[PDB]
Amino acid sequence: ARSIAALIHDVSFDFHGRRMATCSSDQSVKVWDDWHCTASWKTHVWRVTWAHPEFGQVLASCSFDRTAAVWEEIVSHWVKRTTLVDSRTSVTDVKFAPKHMGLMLATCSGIVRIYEAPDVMNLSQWSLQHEISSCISWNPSSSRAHSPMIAVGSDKVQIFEYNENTRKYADPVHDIAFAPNLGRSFHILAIATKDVRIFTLKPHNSQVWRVSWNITGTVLASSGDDGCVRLWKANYMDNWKCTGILKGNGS
Amino acid sequence: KPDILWAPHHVDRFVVCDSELSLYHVELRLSSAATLLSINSDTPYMKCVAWYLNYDPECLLAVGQANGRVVLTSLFKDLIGKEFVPKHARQCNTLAWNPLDSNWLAAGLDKHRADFSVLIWDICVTKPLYELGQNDACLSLCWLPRDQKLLLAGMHRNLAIFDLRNTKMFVNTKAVQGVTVDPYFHDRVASFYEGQVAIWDLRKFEKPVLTLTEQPKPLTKVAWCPTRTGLLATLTRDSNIIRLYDMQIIERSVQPCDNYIASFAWHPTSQNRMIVVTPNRTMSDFTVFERISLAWSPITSLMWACGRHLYECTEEEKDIATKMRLRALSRYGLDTEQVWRNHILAGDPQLKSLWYTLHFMKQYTELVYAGIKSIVKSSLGMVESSRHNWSIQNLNEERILALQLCGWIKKGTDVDVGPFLNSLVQEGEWERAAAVALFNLDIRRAIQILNEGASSELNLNVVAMALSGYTDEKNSLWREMCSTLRLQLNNPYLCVMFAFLTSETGSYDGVLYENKVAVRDRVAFACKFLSDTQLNRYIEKLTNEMKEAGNLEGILLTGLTKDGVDLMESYVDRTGDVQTASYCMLQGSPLDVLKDERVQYWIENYRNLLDAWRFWHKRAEFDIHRSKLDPSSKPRCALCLINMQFNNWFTWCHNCRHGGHAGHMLSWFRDHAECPVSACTCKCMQLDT
Ligand SMILES: [Zn+2]
Ligand SMILES: [Zn+2]
Ligand SMILES: [Zn+2]
Ligand SMILES: [Zn+2]
C-alpha cells in the first residue's frame, strides 16, 4: 500500500512497533523510525531484530562473515558493546530470547550459540551457556508449567527445552515462527517451506520466506517467491484459513 | 533457437526472434497481452539479432544470416536493407553494437583459413573498419561499457580482449560462449561452457574467480540483470525454470511457464522484467520480485518489504488483536458500576450474556461466585408438578438465587417474574417474554404479551391462539400436530414453548437442549421444573457443554472457580481473548482460584500485550483496578538551590545523580539538552528517549 521511503534483506519491528530496523543489501542496518532513516551503521546482515526494551534497545545482526554482531544502545550511531563472533559458520539469523528467560540470543548458523549475559547493564560479555549443534525460533511461553524452548530450522524443526532436572537444553525450512501464546494451552507453529504449514503442539506455491506472527498470534502473514504477502488467519472451526492478500508493490 | 530481445527504448515493445521476425507490443496473452506490429521474413537462416542502440531509426534489427551477411532489417532510410558481407562466407555467431558508439556493429564469424573472424563493421556491401582475430571463431561478443573500444570476444579457445586501438589479453579456457559483461560491475564478466557458467574478473584476468553450479542440461542463455545489483539468470536447455543464480551467492529459481523455455530477456527499462518465449511461441511475461521480509506490528501492520521499498499494509473480520484495541480505547471492563453495560462498552451474544451474569453476581453481592452448578448441589426439597396448573416461593433457597443469577427475578425474595416481564416488553423481546411468562405457569399472561406485542409494530396473534389450545390429553389432536409442527417455527422461543407444553411431564428434553435459547432461560427453567436428581445431572451436562466449547455464557454455570478457569481457558484457546479473561476472572473471584497459574498468567499476557500498544495509562488503570481486587498481587535543586502540584517533585537522574524540582528542571530542559549543574555533560532528558 503506502510505499514509504526506505534492498532491505530483513525489516522487523521492535516490541512497541514504533521503530523499524532494516538490514540493507549493502551490508548496512538502519533504524528507520512517516518512517525516516534515523541511523546509519555500515553493519560489519541477514537478519536484524530488536530486543525487549526493558533490556535496552539492542539490535542483533546476523552476518555472513561467521559472526553475529549485537549493536547496543549508546546514543546517532550505536556502539557495539558486545560482538558475538565466536560462531565458526555464518550466522543465519539472530533472534533474542523472550524477556522472562534473561538476555539470551540465538544464532542458528547448526551451532546454536545461545549467548547469555549475566550482567544486564554490562552486556559486552557473551557467554555460551548452551550450544546445540537456517531458522531460529523462540518460544514466547513464560509459564511455570512451560519450560523455555528453542527451535532450529534447517534448509525440519527441532525444539530443545532446558530441562530443569538436568539444567541443560535437550521441502526445505526457510523460517519458523512461534505464535504468541496469551495463556494458550497449545503452541501454533508456522514453518516456511515449499508449502506453508501450520501445526499445533499441545503439552504462494513456491519457496516461502520469513513469516511472522501478530502481537496476539492469530492473524498470519506468510510470504513466498510468488511476490504476494498473503495474510492468513484462523477460522470458525479453529483451522487456518486465508484472510487476505497484500501487494508488495503497493497495488 | 527462438530468442526474445527487448528494444533499448519503447518500453512497451519487444521482438521475438524466430524463423521469421515478429515485433510485438505489450498491452497472445503475455500475462497483459502482446499485439503484433510487424513481421519480417525476408532474412532466412537468421542466427544473430541485435538492436540498433541509437534512437533514430527505431526498430532496426541487425539480422546476422547463416552465410555471414548482416542484414539491417527494419522490423535515416540509408540504414535499411544494408548487406554487410564478409570476405569469405561462413556462419555469423554473435553480434554486438557498441554502447559508446552505436554505429559499429561488431560481428563474430566462424573459422576460416586466412579470413578475420571478429569484424568491426561501420554502419555509416562494405569493408570492415577493423578486422581483429584471424583463423579462429568468435563465439560471443560483448563491448566493455566503460572503454569506448574494447570488445571482449570469446574465441574457439580463449576469451580474448581485443583492443581496437592496437589490434590482446587472452585466458585460454573452455568457457568462451555467451559473454555478457554485468552492467553495474564493469569489472565482472560471465561466460558459460556446456552446463557450467563462470564469473570472471577483468582486474584479475588469469583464472575464473567463481565457477557456479553445473546444471545437468547445457546452458542456452546467460544474461545479467540491468535492474538489480547483479543477478545472472541462467537458462538451461529443456528446462522450465530460470535458475537466477544471484552473484550478490544465493541461488533462486523461477518457473514462469509450464513448458520448456527457449530464451528470456531482461527489460533494460522495466524493473526486472522476464519476458519468456516457449518453443510454441508462448510469450509469457514473468516477474521475479525480491523476497518479502514480513514482520507484524502490535497495531497489526504488515511492513511488506519487497526489494528496496517498505510497503506498509497498515491493516489494509475484527481480529482479536484489532478487537482489543477498540475495547481498551473505550475502557472496557474497568467500568465496574453498570456491569450489565460492559458489553455495550465493548461495541457479542456470548459477551452480552457474560456481563449480565457478572452483573447479577455483583448485584446479589451488593457461594454465589461458585456458579449455578455448586449452588444447586446443596439444594434439597424438590417437588415435581405432574400437571401444569395455570395461575415460586415453594422453591429452595438455592433455586431462588439461581433464578436471580439468570435474571428471571429481581433482587430479593419476591416470588414473581412480573418486573422481569415488563422489562422484556420494554426491551422489545416479545417472543422471549411469552416463553418466560409461560414458564411461570401463566398462559393468559403469555397470551396477553403476544396479543399486546402483535398489536404493535401479526403472526403473534395466531401464536397466542395456538398457545390457547393446550390440551393435556395423551392422544389429543392438539398434541398430535403441535408437537410435529413446532419444528417449523422461526423464533426458537416460540418453539420451546410448544416443546415444553407438548413434552410429557418429567422429561422436558425438548426445551432443556435447545441451543438457540439463551442458557440463562434454560437454566432458570430447569431450576423450576427439574428434580434435584435430574437437575444436578443436567447441569453437569450443560457445564461440560460450555466447558469444552469455551462459551462465555457458561460462566453462569461454571462460576469463578477452578472449573471457571478451565472453561475460560477453552474460550481463550478457541478465540484468544485474554482481555475478557483478565477482567472477568478479577471481578469477585476468590483468592485461591485467582492464585492459579493460568489466571495469573492471563493477566501477565494482557499487561504485556497492552504495553506493546503504548496504552501505558490504560494499563495503569488496570493495575490499580487489579491491585484493589487482588491484594495478593501487590539534595538540592540545581536551579533554585532549594533543598528537597507536580512541579515540587524531585527529579533524580539515574546517570549523573543530578536533578531538582520538576517545574524548574523541565523549564531548563525545555530549551536545553544538558544537565544544568556545572561540569556535567549528561543529557538527562534525552538519554531515556
Ligand atoms: Zn534548583
Ligand atoms: Zn548531571
Ligand atoms: Zn528547584
Ligand atoms: Zn543526568
UniProtKB/Swiss-Prot annotation, chain A:
WD repeats lie at residues 7-37, 43-75, 86-125, 133-170, 171-203, 204-242. Keywords: Cell cycle, Cell division, Centromere, Chromosome, Chromosome partition, Isopeptide bond, Kinetochore, Lysosome, Membrane, Mitosis, mRNA transport, Nuclear pore complex, Nucleus, Phosphoprotein, Protein transport, Repeat, Translocation, Transport, Ubl conjugation, WD repeat. The GATOR2 complex is negatively regulated by the upstream amino acid sensors CASTOR1 and SESN2, which sequester the GATOR2 complex in absence of amino acids. In the presence of abundant amino acids, GATOR2 is released from CASTOR1 and SESN2 and activated. Signal peptide: none annotated. GO terms for cellular component: cytosol; GATOR2 complex; kinetochore; lysosomal membrane; nuclear envelope; nuclear pore; nuclear pore outer ring; Seh1-associated complex. InterPro entries: G-protein_beta_WD-40_rep, Sec13/Seh1_fam, WD40/YVTN_repeat-like_dom_sf, WD40_repeat_dom_sf, WD40_rpt. Transmembrane segments: none annotated. One of its GO terms (molecular function) is structural molecule activity. GO terms for biological process: attachment of mitotic spindle microtubules to kinetochore; cell division; cellular response to amino acid starvation; cellular response to nutrient levels; defense response to Gram-positive bacterium; mitotic metaphase chromosome alignment; mRNA transport; negative regulation of TORC1 signaling. The modification Phosphoserine is found at residue 147. Its main location: nucleus. PROSITE patterns: WD_REPEATS_2, WD_REPEATS_REGION. It is found in: Chromosome, Centromere, Kinetochore; Nucleus, Nuclear pore complex; Lysosome membrane. SUPFAM superfamilies: WD40 repeat-like (SSF50978). Pfam families: WD40 (PF00400). Belongs to the WD repeat SEC13 family. Component of the Nup107-160 subcomplex of the nuclear pore complex (NPC). The Nup107-160 subcomplex includes NUP160, NUP133, NUP107, NUP98, NUP85, NUP43, NUP37, SEH1 and SEC13. The SEH1 subunit appears to be only weakly associated with the Nup107-160 subcomplex. Component of the GATOR2 subcomplex, composed of MIOS, SEC13, SEH1L, WDR24 and WDR59. The GATOR2 complex interacts with CASTOR1 and CASTOR2; the interaction is negatively regulated by arginine. The GATOR2 complex interacts with SESN1, SESN2 and SESN3; the interaction is negatively regulated by amino acids. This is Nucleoporin SEH1. The gene is SEH1L.
Swiss-Prot record, chain B:
Zn(2+) 4 binds at residues 656, 658, 675, 680. Zn(2+) 2 binds at residues 640, 661, 664. A zinc finger (RING-type) spans 635-689. SUPFAM superfamilies: WD40 repeat-like. InterPro entries: MIOS/Sea4, MIOS_a-sol, WD40/YVTN_repeat-like_dom_sf, WD40_repeat_dom_sf, WD40_rpt, Zn_ribbon_mio. Signal peptide: none annotated. Keywords: Lysosome, Membrane, Metal-binding, Phosphoprotein, Repeat, WD repeat, Zinc, Zinc-finger. Component of the GATOR2 subcomplex, composed of MIOS, SEC13, SEH1L, WDR24 and WDR59. The GATOR2 complex interacts with CASTOR1 and CASTOR2; the interaction is negatively regulated by arginine. CASTOR1 and CASTOR2 convey leucine availability via direct interaction with MIOS. The GATOR2 complex interacts with SESN1, SESN2 and SESN3; the interaction is negatively regulated by amino acids. Belongs to the WD repeat mio family. This is GATOR2 complex protein MIOS.
